[PDB]
Symmetry: D4
Subunit: 205 residues, 8 copies
């Protein structure tokens, strides 16, 4: 499995002249104002991944952020609500064309309440995501090989997931519903950053 | 004064709604659109008058009301439009899509309270007292009582004024584009409820 | 104004119950029939009068009342008959079979509220103010107070009129055979409580 | 060695169901019948074989199956019939009258345990291991899917016989019968909008 | 109005407690006897008068009061004696063991309610209105305000009458020996609390 | 060897129980004594052997066993006696006076844990693995399985040894008189359960 | 009502009314979340029966006179539930006071016979006073505050001096003075912990 | 495997603790210092060795240990020092001033997990599998077992290394002054526990 490890940013975008990119982040935790962005992982869906180490206090990542704001490229996330929040918070740029496999799962896998990426991978691809490195020091100067491998595998499968979910969304006639959710998702992430992370803004109470 | 025009089935015409924003509210037999039918639709232009339209059981159309709801040039103002949008779309087959919700607006601006009910908002923003005593009554009755007609009309009489104040607040706190994205999703949030996700926050992690 | 006939043990005859439906309520020392004995049985024909029957500790029979409760040609009207059927069957060894329950009926028609208590229903459907101050008193006292006699009577004075309204609403919402099935099972539901399943919804998944 | 006959849409005929009681189960896209369509109906006569019927999306009719469902001289056996009766009636418009439910039966007899799932029941009563390990709307079911679907009806006759012995011994037969008589209306109540409500509760 | 004798440290003598049963109550700085000291001990013979005894910080003895509490021929009547026995035993080192508790008696007889507070019991059994406004105040104050002494006294004024009524109920429902056994264990239930088991129902399965 | 004697109805005689203390356990159809009958009674003298007695449906007497249960010179050792005393007394009409409970003893001595089940206690104190697999089986079967017989016996085989250890800990931690008072109340706690207070901590404030 | 209240824009004109040992402090905001809900008003009483009400503007970053007061080691800052006020004051102006007294902590250390420790409840019991919490829900960011708003904000500091005195009496009586002192010393860091991201976390709990 | 010195009562001297920081752990009869006595104190200098000190019931003095505990030139390292400080100060009357707590450190640095127990911390930071089997054993036994001794020594063996790693993370994330202030308050937090506030977050709004 080719994993390309970088300091700061992609060297260029030669591997990303594509319709859709898989994106994932690693952080020091779930609170963007407290827990910094540590890693950004990318994949074109060709079985290879780029793992990008983000330094403490890093202000720019010009090639990556160009990708994130290219409206002709769909950004695929699993639970992008999280990734979009810490990415926009770090680099000041909120993507607006996105696909989320966790939203897709909740719209199609109506026979389960387990929508984690591990469960989705095991069910739709018979691929075993190992969640051991999830709780590790992602801010470490040098990432372990197990850290690099775990971070890369969280992006390696998202294109295949996207294709299967797109089939299910069409079969159950929920395409326009999913699209509206994906359209709002950047604003749902913004709401989190502005102080509404604990509030379902559409709830009655 | 307290002018309330009560109608059977539909508005007779749209003469009173050559305007850019109409206040809308409904009454039903309950909170479950597949079980509890639409019984009343209330409208107001904001001129202190109100229109109250009784909806018959099994009624599938209301062409004048539905033209108003369909008009992309007319904003439909609701309090908690998530509810009204769902029952209206389920009954008449059309989902409005230019909307404004005073409850979402309140949750985006009245950040100092967990009380965002229409009664609370009217009390604090306008010093108008709203009585919820008829909220739980037989809205399906063939003839509505006078207390019933007045309660229903007062739920739309004040929404124009609330919208103006919330728009000031959304501007002052720089939350206009946030509020607009929420209103853009609201019709689909209501479709999610009809489709079977009414108990699910679709954006939650678990 | 309201005539209340008080009896010890049993009605003297059934001269006042040559009718097709009788309102029935009970008073007890509490909610657990194996521990809390039946203290009072109240009956009404629907004519604005009531009979209040004091049941002695250890009383095993009441022939006239039990004949009433066994008469399949006479519907027994309860509010939440699930409770009354259990204590009645436990005390006298007879489970009434032809019943109407205003609380089930409320849950089947008053779909716009979650308050299905008798006091709530009387206020909304009849504009009649039950007072619940005497519900918590010593119903086993040798002499019932004037307040107790009044309260016990008022819990059967309106069940006929409630039934007529709920029956109209069940017809309107096309829920008659649903209601009839629930009333059919209700004696068995009360038997289930006596047998040991009072805490279990027998139909729940878990 | 378990014979499983797979069908598209309906049984071809009723030659294997000239019987007093049939085991019935379903697979769906989820627990909410207004959203999650019927995908599979499974039947067994109790002879160790099963019929697995694939229900197409949008399918309105299944004449042989539905004839069975509405034949009052044939008892429909379920595990938690409340669910299956709801999706069957919602899909084909016919609510069965004459039913037997092993989950209700378990709750009336297995008073020594708090676990009334079919897997728990089979393990204890029959020493049989049910495995509950998917997309039931797939065009082609997998071998594992076909076998899981059949295994949920192969045991209900034997479970029913044992539960009848326990209902008789504990003198709860007429209690069970009344619960079975109400069960179709309980499923109907679910479809009308009372799925979250114990209709007999005080509050 | 109410004759209340206020003392510092102890009763001046025992001349008013040559009786069969005494009503006892306490005031503290809180519910945790290792942190919250005893501040007041109230007594009454049931004659309409009460003694209110101020306890000093660090006071280790109260000879006349503790004589009463140790007297086996004198029943001590508490409402929720579990609390009073704990703090009385902690402060003075003597644990009464001839006791009667109106809360336990209420839970054994007033099976038609779940409200067993003293104010609730006083209202129902005696039509007497205990006011609880002074419950949360500085009972450690050097000088108790008239409001406090009146509140302190009212908590012992009625325990004799309540005991009589509950003893009739315990006889009627044939629970006398049940009540006796619970009263017998109550000093040890208080000890269990002081020893570290106050959050544990020692008899619960889990 | 583990010799288990199986009996129908009662012990043949008391020749194996001329002892100071007897281990007792029961099996039933469930946790509700008014619904779930006594099925098995198990006894052990602590000599490594056990008697397993099958109780028939509707059995009213067991003269030798019940002689043991009311012999005040023999302590009856249970694990969670609150349960066994209730079903035994409910079945045969005789409530023991003199008991020891290993679960209460565990709650008073094993203050470092919240797991007080028999299996847990046997594992820690004796390094004896009790299997709980047969705990939920049909105990009313005409013929018990060998696994059932061996499971039933093993619930009484270790209670004497547990008693010895808990008594050592009660002594070391100076809690003997606390335990004794708990054991003295335990029959009345079980009696309160049968009378209708099974869900009530009678000593709780609320 | 109508006690003397001096309403200011932005800051105090000077500190002439604050050559004292302890100052009563309170704030009004748009909510409980300092990173979202801006500081709107600061209220001060010297204990002399008068009060100063300071309008804070959106985006305002300095209040030199006020901040001098908050930074003064010789002047104790008295709050009710200072955990909140310290966080929003530190967040808006960049300065965290560290000589503080809190009547809610003190209430939790002395009023051990109750579980109601809000300012309303303390004032009713200790002083026989009503602090009409009805204006708690109003627009504290309005251009012009109402007379009703000015008097509610002012009354939330008129009583803190008398409350401190009664509580110091209680801490002395129950021998908890050094316990209260330790709690007050940590309080500014408890406020910092909230701003930094631990507002939902009892940092000392086992879990 | 590792050198463990077992002592009765106290260290013989401080020859092994002429150091800047000492790792400290205790074993007890439970979580409640007023009820559950100190049984064992464990120490380590960080050199791979440990001292295991058996504390007798009623023991009032441990002069060498307590000299260590009050030496302000020696940092005392705990995991969840809130517990150990409370029981140590309660037992010997001396509260350490200068402490470091790995669980507070963890809550301030391991912000990517919600599991802060010592086992989880060792697993992640050191790849060290702490066995927690001996947690539920009789720590007050006269003679500890080798498994007990070895489990007791295991905790303190890693605290110096954990401290070093946690200090690196506190420096990296710029939280050292935050941590110092928490460690400075920690002895008063343990004091609050002994004084009666163990269930109370003293800094919370409610
Ligand atoms: Cl049928
Ligand atoms: Cl005995
Ligand atoms: Na992700
Ligand atoms: Na990741
Ligand atoms: Na309305
Ligand atoms: Na609405
Ligand atoms: Na009734
Ligand atoms: Na009644
Ligand atoms: Na199935
Ligand atoms: Na047919
Ligand atoms: Na089933
Ligand atoms: Na008391
Ligand atoms: Na009192
Ligand atoms: Na057993
Ligand atoms: Na037992
Ligand atoms: Na404040
Ligand atoms: Na304030
Ligand atoms: Na330890
Ligand atoms: Na520790």
């Amino acid at each position: 499995t080719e994993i390309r490890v970088h300091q700061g940013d992609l060297p260029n975008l030669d591997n990303y002249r594509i319709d859709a990119v898989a994106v994932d982040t690693e952080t020091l935790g779930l609170q963007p104002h407290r827990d910094r962005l540590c890693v950004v992982q990318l994949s074109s869906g060709d079985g290879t991944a780029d793992v990008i180490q983000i330094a403490k206090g890093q202000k720019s990542a010009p090639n990556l952020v160009r990708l994130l704001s290219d409206r002709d490229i769909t950004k695929i996330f699993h639970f992008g609500r999280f990734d979009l929040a810490i990415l926009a918070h770090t680099f000041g740029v909120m993507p607006d064309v996105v696909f989320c496999t966790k939203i897709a799962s909740k719209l199609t896998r109506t026979y389960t309440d387990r929508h984690g990426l591990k469960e989705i991978c095991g069910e739709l691809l018979n691929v075993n995501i190992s969640k051991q490195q999830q709780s590790s020091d992602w801010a470490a100067e040098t990432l372990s090989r197990a850290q690099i491998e775990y971070a890369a595998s969280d992006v390696l499968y998202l294109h295949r997931l996207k294709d299967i979910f797109e089939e299910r969304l069409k079969r159950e006639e929920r395409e326009s519903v999913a699209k509206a959710c994906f359209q709002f998702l950047p604003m749902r992430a913004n709401l989190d950053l502005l102080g509404w992370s604990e509030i379902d803004i559409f709830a009655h109470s």
